[PDB]
């Protein structure tokens, strides 16, 4: 899960 | 040492809107993930959103989903929450929770919507 | 936001008992994200389990989640007077990030 949820927010630094 | 202080109780008239605030403290030399859920009074608690370590990200619930904004200030380790056009639904207890999977929370704050 | 379903809605049981307390999804659960939590009352939730069955740091070994597909299962092996408490599952998921609570099950004390 942690992370998938991290990947999420990948395109957002 | 994870814990979360939130700020206090607010009364709102409907349409208005309301900014909370939850912040670190303890152990506050990482940062994670917080989570906003609400609670209406005899209902079970409501998730409303996320955001992101570093504040750049943020999801929120389809029902809330353009009512809610959430921002941090990393430098105080303070997360907000502003939930906007207030409704009579809107009244109940409002939490932070932090990391993936809830795991400690703030003491909530009582968000009473009425004129 | 996921479906869930509690069942029963208020378990009567006196301490000492076993307590089994079940979730069930609408459809089957991606992944196992099924988590569990305790809440009193004027208190906030409190995490249990993840991951199905991954107990929470500092939660006692007579708490337990086993569970695959749309069933899911909390067990508590002998309830203690501070397990009475309303607990609710929840289903999680990464894209996008959801995480919906169910409607909880209340453990009261039969007399």
């Known amino acids: 899960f942690k992370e998938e949820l991290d990947k999420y927010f990948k395109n957002h630094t | 040492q994870l814990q979360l202080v939130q700020s206090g109780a607010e009364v709102k008239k409907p349409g208005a809107s309301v900014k909370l605030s939850c912040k670190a403290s303890?152990?506050?030399?990482?940062?994670?993930?917080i989570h906003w859920v609400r609670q209406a009074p005899g209902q079970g608690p409501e998730w409303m959103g996320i955001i992101n370590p570093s504040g750049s990200g943020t999801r929120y619930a389809q029902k809330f989903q353009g009512r809610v904004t959430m921002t941090r200030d990393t430098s105080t380790s303070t997360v907000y929450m502003e939930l906007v056009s207030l409704r009579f639904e809107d009244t109940a207890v409002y939490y932070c929770a932090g990391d993936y999977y809830l795991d400690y929370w703030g003491q909530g704050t009582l968000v009473t919507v009425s004129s | 936001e996921f479906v869930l379903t509690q069942s029963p809605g208020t378990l009567s049981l006196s301490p000492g008992e076993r307590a089994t307390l079940s979730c069930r999804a609408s459809q089957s659960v991606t992944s196992n994200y099924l988590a569990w939590y305790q809440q009193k009352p004027g208190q906030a939730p409190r995490l249990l389990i993840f991951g199905a069955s991954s107990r929470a740091t500092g939660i006692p070994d007579r708490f337990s989640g086993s569970g695959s597909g749309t069933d899911f299962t909390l067990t508590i092996s002998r309830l203690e007077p501070e397990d009475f408490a309303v607990y609710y599952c929840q289903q999680y998921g990464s894209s996008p990030p959801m995480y919906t609570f169910g409607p909880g099950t209340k453990v009261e004390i039969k007399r």
């Open positions: 303890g152990n506050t030399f990482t940062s994670h993930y």
